[PDB]
Curated annotation (Swiss-Prot):
Region (Activation loop): 351-375
GO BP of this protein: inner ear development; lysosome organization; phosphatidylinositol biosynthetic process; phosphatidylinositol phosphate biosynthetic process; phosphatidylinositol-mediated signaling; receptor-mediated endocytosis; signal transduction
Source organism: Homo sapiens (Human)
Activity: how regulated: Inhibited by wortmannin and adenosine. Increased kinase activity upon interaction with NCS1/FREQ.
Catalytic loop: annotated segments: 332-340
Protein name: Phosphatidylinositol 4-kinase beta
Expression sites (tissue/organ): Widely expressed with highest levels in heart, skeletal muscle, pancreas, testis and ovary. Weakly expressed in liver. Expressed in the innear ear in the epithelium of the spinal organ of corti.
Function: Phosphorylates phosphatidylinositol (PI) in the first committed step in the production of the second messenger inositol-1,4,5,-trisphosphate (PIP). May regulate Golgi disintegration/reorganization during mitosis, possibly via its phosphorylation. Involved in Golgi-to-plasma membrane trafficking. May play an important role in the inner ear development.
Main location: membrane
Domain PI3K/PI4K catalytic residues, every copy: 201-462
Region entry G-loop, spans: 205-211
Cofactor(s) essential for the protein: Mg(2+); Mn(2+)
Family in the record: Belongs to the PI3/PI4-kinase family. Type III PI4K subfamily.
Amino acid sequence: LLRLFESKLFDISMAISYLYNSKEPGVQAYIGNRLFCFRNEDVDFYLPQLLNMYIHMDEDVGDAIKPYIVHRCRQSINFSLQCALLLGAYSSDMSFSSPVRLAPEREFIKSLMAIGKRLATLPTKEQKTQRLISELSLLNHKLPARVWLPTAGFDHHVVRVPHTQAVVLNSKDKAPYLIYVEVLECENFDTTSVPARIPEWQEKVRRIREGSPYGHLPNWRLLSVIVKCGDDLRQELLAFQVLKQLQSIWEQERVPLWIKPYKILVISADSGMIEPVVNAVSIHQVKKQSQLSLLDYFLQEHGSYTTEAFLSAQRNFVQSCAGYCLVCYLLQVKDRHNGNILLDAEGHIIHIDFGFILSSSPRNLGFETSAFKLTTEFVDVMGGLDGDMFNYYKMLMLQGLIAARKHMDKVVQIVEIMQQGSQLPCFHGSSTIRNLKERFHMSMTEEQLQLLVEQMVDGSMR
Ligand SMILES: COc1ccc(-c2c(C)nc3c(N)cc(Cl)nn23)cc1OC
């Protein structure tokens, strides 16, 4: 990057950029020393990009990043966990500060994933659930301990697992399972000590709490996760990064677009944990259960046409649908079906299963392509092709596309970096980044962008 950054900014994304892109002899180390000057929480986002740069890139870059992580690994234990896991997952084809530091955690995770790997023999989901709880009952024996769910945005200890409420999501061999976990918040996980056991919609929080020994605690907080033992979440993690970025961007420029990136934890190349969305539901399931048109569902659940509940509902619907049309466009998300889109109790829609994105396309699939489509049933919810909020939809898409163009470097950066030494389908040659850049359309005028958006909408409906 041409040295010549002397014309100062200076920004964390851009610093990463100078670290990745720069061929100058002195700058890699410089940035390496400038990372310390940054808000730790800001740096922790690009973490998977640092290690993948650490792993697959030059010794200059390696030795450049190297001191920062050690500074932090000493500083934060969860950070260390992350560094380890990601060091294991992202290299293919290429009582703390003691060695027992992470052992309880390692064994916790190992347990959960083993449990998940044991379900294969049992064909049908119900059997799997029963066996699951039967095996899952055993952890509270060893609990509490020094253990935490990195998913949580707070330091904590896992003191209990309400085993009875565990469920299994599907009948496959690699089929995931959802669990609920009772934890108690600390101020600092490193300083604070381990509490002591007590052996005796989402209101599940309640009915668990009142049914829990540690329930009475003011610290007490419930968490939930999805343990996928046979699945590779690295791609999906990339999706998480991108989504989070676009969220930040759209927040900055004050565009109403609503998307909810859900957290991702990559434990291994075949393993990982996801943080579930609450109160949202499959939208296929709505069609099945309700036996109602999506609109009619909106009219059943929230109010009627003039009811503020309805208006808010479909407004959030529109904004959401828009944000995700844009996301799906840029990121070239595929494999969209009702199974992949949820609907929250507030009336948003939430996409999942990001496994197929960018250059990654599903097999089979003769002559039908699996992509975001605006169903008639959707428009019916919004309005109609001529409808008061449809123009709002399109306008929103336009605005978001603009702001995206503005911040494009930040978004492309993540991907471009994570392309290094990857075995993943999403990366195909230099095609991926190219097509992405061209997907931002920096050469277009907002009128041509309005046109484009007209083409995108028209192209969705068919
Ligand atoms: C198969 O793998 C997955 C299974 C479930 C979810 C997920 C999340 C993060 N939130 C929800 C939710 N609220 C409902 C359902 Cl059914 N799934 N789900 C995401 C997955 O990643 C692809």
